[PDB]
Amino acid sequence: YSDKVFDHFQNPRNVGKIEDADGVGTVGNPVCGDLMTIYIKVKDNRIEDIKFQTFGCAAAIATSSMATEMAKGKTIEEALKITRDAVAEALGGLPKQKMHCSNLAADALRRAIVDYFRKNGKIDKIKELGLEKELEKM
Amino acid sequence: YSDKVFDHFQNPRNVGKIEDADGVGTVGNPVCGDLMTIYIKVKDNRIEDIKFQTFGCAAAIATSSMATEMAKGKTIEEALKITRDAVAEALGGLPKQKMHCSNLAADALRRAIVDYFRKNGKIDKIKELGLEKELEKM
Amino acid sequence: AYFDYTSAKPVDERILEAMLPYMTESFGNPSSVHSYGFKAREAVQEAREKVAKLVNGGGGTVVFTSGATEANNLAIIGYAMRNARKGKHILVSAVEHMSVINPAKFLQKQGFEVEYIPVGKYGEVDVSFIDQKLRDDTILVSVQHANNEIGTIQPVEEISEVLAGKAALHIDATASVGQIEVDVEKIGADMLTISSNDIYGPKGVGALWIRKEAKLQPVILGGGQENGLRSGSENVPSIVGFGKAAEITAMEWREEAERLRRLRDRIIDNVLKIEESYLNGHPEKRLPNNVNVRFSYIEGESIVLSLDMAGIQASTGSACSSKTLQPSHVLMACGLKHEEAHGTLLLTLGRYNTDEDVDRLLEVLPGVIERLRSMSP
Amino acid sequence: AYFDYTSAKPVDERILEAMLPYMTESFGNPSSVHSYGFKAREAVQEAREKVAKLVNGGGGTVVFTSGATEANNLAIIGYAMRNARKGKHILVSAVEHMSVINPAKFLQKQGFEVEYIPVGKYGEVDVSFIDQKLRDDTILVSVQHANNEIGTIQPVEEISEVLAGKAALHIDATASVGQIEVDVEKIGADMLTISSNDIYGPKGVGALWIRKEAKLQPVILGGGQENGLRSGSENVPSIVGFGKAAEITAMEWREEAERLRRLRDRIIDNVLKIEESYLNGHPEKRLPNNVNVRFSYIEGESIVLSLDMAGIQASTGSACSSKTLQPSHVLMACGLKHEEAHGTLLLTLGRYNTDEDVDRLLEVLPGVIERLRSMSPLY
Numbered sequence A, B: 001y002s003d004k005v006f007d008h009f010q011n012p013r014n015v016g017k018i019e020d021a022d023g024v025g026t027v028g029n030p031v032c033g034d035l036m037t038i039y040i041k042v043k044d045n046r047i048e049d050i051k052f053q054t055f056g057c058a059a060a061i062a063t064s065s066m067a068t069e070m071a072k073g074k075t076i077e078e079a080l081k082i083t084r085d086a087v088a089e090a091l092g093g094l095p096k097q098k099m100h101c102s103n104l105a106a107d108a109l110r111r112a113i114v115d116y117f118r119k120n121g122k123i124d125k126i127k128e129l130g131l132e133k134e135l136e137k138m
Numbered sequence C: 001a002y003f004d005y006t007s008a009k010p011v012d013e014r015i016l017e018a019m020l021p022y023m024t025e026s027f028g029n030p031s032s033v034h035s036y037g038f039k040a041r042e043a044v045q046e047a048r049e050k051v052a053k054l055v056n057g058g059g060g061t062v063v064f065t066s067g068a069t070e071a072n073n074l075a076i077i078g079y080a081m082r083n084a085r086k087g088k089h090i091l092v093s094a095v096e097h098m099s100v101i102n103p104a105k106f107l108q109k110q111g112f113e114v115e116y117i118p119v120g121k122y123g124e125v126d127v128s129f130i131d132q133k134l135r136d137d138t139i140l141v142s143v144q145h146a147n148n149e150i151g152t153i154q155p156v157e158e159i160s161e162v163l164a165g166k167a168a169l170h171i172d173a174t175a176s177v178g179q180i181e182v183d184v185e186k187i188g189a190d191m192l193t194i195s196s197n198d199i200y201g202p203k204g205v206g207a208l209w210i211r212k213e214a215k216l217q218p219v220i221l222g223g224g225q226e227n228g229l230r231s232g233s234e235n236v237p238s239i240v241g242f243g244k245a246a247e248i249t250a251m252e253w254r255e256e257a258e259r260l261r262r263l264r265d266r267i268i269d270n271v272l273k274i275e276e277s278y279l280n281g282h283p284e285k286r287l288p289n290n291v292n293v294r295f296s297y298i299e300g301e302s303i304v305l306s307l308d309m310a311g312i313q314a315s316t317g318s319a320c321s322s323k324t325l326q327p328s329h330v331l332m333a334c335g336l337k338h339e340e341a342h343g344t345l346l347l348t349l350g351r352y353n354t355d356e357d358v359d360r361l362l363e364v365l366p367g368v369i370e371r372l373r374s375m376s377p
Numbered sequence D: 001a002y003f004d005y006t007s008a009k010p011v012d013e014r015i016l017e018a019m020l021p022y023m024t025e026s027f028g029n030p031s032s033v034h035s036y037g038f039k040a041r042e043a044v045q046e047a048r049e050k051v052a053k054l055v056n057g058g059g060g061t062v063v064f065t066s067g068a069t070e071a072n073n074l075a076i077i078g079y080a081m082r083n084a085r086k087g088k089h090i091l092v093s094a095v096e097h098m099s100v101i102n103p104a105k106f107l108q109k110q111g112f113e114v115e116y117i118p119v120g121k122y123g124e125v126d127v128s129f130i131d132q133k134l135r136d137d138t139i140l141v142s143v144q145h146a147n148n149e150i151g152t153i154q155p156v157e158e159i160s161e162v163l164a165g166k167a168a169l170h171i172d173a174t175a176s177v178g179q180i181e182v183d184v185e186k187i188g189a190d191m192l193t194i195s196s197n198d199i200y201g202p203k204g205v206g207a208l209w210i211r212k213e214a215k216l217q218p219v220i221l222g223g224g225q226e227n228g229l230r231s232g233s234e235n236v237p238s239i240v241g242f243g244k245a246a247e248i249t250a251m252e253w254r255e256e257a258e259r260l261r262r263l264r265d266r267i268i269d270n271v272l273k274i275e276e277s278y279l280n281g282h283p284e285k286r287l288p289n290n291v292n293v294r295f296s297y298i299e300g301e302s303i304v305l306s307l308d309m310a311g312i313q314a315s316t317g318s319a320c321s322s323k324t325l326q327p328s329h330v331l332m333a334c335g336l337k338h339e340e341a342h343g344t345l346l347l348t349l350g351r352y353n354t355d356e357d358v359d360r361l362l363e364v365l366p367g368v369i370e371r372l373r374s375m376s377p378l379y
């Protein structure tokens, strides 16, 4: 694990929850059992509040910390561009086998955008942001 | 190996030929290809003089040296009691596997005696002491 | 605060002092017909009588290997392959190290019938099972003496009796030596694995003990060392190290085993004062140096990494810590849920452990559980 | 005067200085996910790269083993069983180490067809044999870089040309590394055996180098270390020492070798002045460290032990020395008769030999020969 993965492991950014609120995405991994929950709030389409709750390995806790802090102050458009590979490169690489830990921090940020949409009634943005698969999953 | 093996091999006794030889015994080991010959001069039914020439390892030299040292100045009756196990004991034992090298010396000594008997018509004595088998083997 | 002794151990200073002259002054090859070889020869047999003595093995032979792994490979495959005409049936414990299990699986591929021996909740082998499914074409049984993952000591002396010599008994004693009594006479071993680093000898060397007139075929083929059983020029320095270690284990094990249990319990009776903590493995019939506990709601690798940050080195059976992302098979055999296996923490105590270490362990751990729980659904 | 470097070498103090910290201070397990484990991985990997670089091995992977014997075993058995589907025919040189020959013989019971490549009088492998015996189902050719017994350097590049990517080429380089240039690219190796103690590293560790795309099955089974190819907690200190030795060999070897070549030549030109002495192995295509001679009328073990009472360690190929009482298969392969392998003497040179040692060998030897000869029925 890179020195950056460590920093974000010992000092994770944005741990917690925001009660009965906007976007919240829950995903688990079929392969290793890990579970993650992401909490967000928005400006009109620009994230001003974010926290995470995670169950997994050091890599996993580091992806959410980096994924969350990458998505702070950025618009809905910008933080849809935070992919598995983006969190990974920011964290200065990960071992193969830890890669799925990035997917988890990516899809938990995916799904909490699929909430500020399913909970605000915007089904055109879901089928138009190519993000149709996840609303048809939660 | 052993302290006596090492002393005998390093300072081997009774090395040489004998032009005169009242008896000559030569044997070869089928397995390792060692060769040995012992020369005796017999005066009054005693080994007045003895020499050996041997082609072989450290054990074969030590055994040749001991055997001849054990034979020198003895009556023929006495010298015949010098088996392979008496050469092996007088040296401190041998690795099993070096055991045939004491054999080689024992035989060569027995053959030089049978040889002394056969050259001098004392053929009844070959019968008397059982060495018909060893005599047949030449 | 190194609590990871089952993964690796330092070499004892005194073992090291005994190895060096063989690395640099007496570096000869025991096969050589000169003084350098002769010195290497005496060094190796002293070592060999010494390892032998250590397990009461006068009634057998020690075969030197590159470690416990290789030794296990030689007892399962070397024995199975040599003795096949008698039968093709083998029982193996389900909590065996993978250096037994994986050679067992290989055997299956070559058409042996292998059944795996179930254990109960704390990982004790089912002895009745052995007794029932013992057939007459059974040639081999492999059962560990103790389990490095959960500490549980196995009922081998009894297992021996249920076989009565209708099968060879292999015992992996990597975990056990130095920890609890290992007499091959008391346990009726026919083959016994021994590991040099597990008794503070050097890494890189190990042994199989073999009862006189049991017969094995070699796995490593070559120039014919160890009487045909294991080829390769002999690693005289590491062998002479293994020799000393055995020698020192024999003098000191009982004293330090005692110190170690005293430490183990203290860790146990405190650690379980944490909300939602369960001990893995048998609580009493257990290795002195072994603590394996699980923690609900959190995950293993996370715990170990938070400890390492406090300067504490430990271990876990978590799937997330594994390169195949598989959880510990030992723990699945015990019947732990996959989700339960996540939060295991393994502390392995050893020769250099001290009171202050334990003090520090008990003062940093609680913060790790609470803090990791602060984050978990 | 130690003249037996083929059988065992001392560890260089420099190698011993890099090893010791891993034995008492930094003893972690490479698979442990903590600091001690992380220092352990990093040192193992450093070493892995230093052994690759020594042989120019970036085009493939380094697998650590317990020595050259196991690596030879893994390369022969491991390669063959894994690629059996593309054929079951193997060629193995007649002079190979027993750690290649015996795995070869095991595969002959497992349904493989093995042919052993003859050598000519100098122990050089017959390249036209390989060329003729090669078939659509040949999957593996094993041929040493050089012989440790008679010093002959083998024609590997040619062989590589002949095989020309129809079959895997395995090269045992235990003898050559540090003596002559060992470059897996230049010689077209698919698998290459390396030995730690032959480059003054510790005993009890080794390497097989494996080109990218070569597949093997493992021989030692357990926890999947070395990516599954060779199980067992890693012997971190030996690996690090292996690594230090590789580093030393890469920077020092050409100087070391010119010095051994001169000592060797000096030995040969004087040793052949004894009546009835012959050189075995090639006179020119010969390792810088190798003198192998025979003397008629006397036995090998007896030459070696006479030298040892004077203070000189050496070696012989004599049946009398064996323990199974069989002479050297290398010597018989060259067409020496059993009679003449009896009087063989092998001196192998190494890093700590001085001109003083040669003086000593040159003043003691003629007298040993003469002494033994005076006792020989044959002389």
Ligand SMILES: Cc1ncc(COP(=O)(O)O)c(C=O)c1O
Pocket: C006, C007, C067, C068, C069, C070, C097, C099, C144, C146, C147, C148, C149, C172, C174, C175, C195, D232, D233
């Ligand atoms: C019980 C047991 N047997 C055998 C082994 C294999 O040990 P090594 O990795 O040193 O070959 C281990 C693991 O160390 C073990 O715990």
Ligand SMILES: Cc1ncc(COP(=O)(O)O)c(C=O)c1O
Pocket: C231, C232, C233, D006, D007, D067, D068, D069, D070, D072, D097, D099, D144, D148, D172, D173, D174, D175, D195
């Ligand atoms: C060419 C060659 N290969 C393999 C070996 C076997 O090496 P080890 O006995 O260290 O395993 C030797 C022995 O020195 C050798 O000379």
Ligand code: FES
Pocket: A032, A033, A034, A055, A056, A057, A058, A059, A060, A097, A098, A101, C319, C320
């Ligand atoms: S969370 Fe299971 S591997 Fe990172």
Ligand code: FES
Pocket: B029, B032, B033, B034, B055, B056, B057, B058, B059, B060, B098, B101, D319, D320
């Ligand atoms: S003479 Fe051949 S082994 Fe002693």
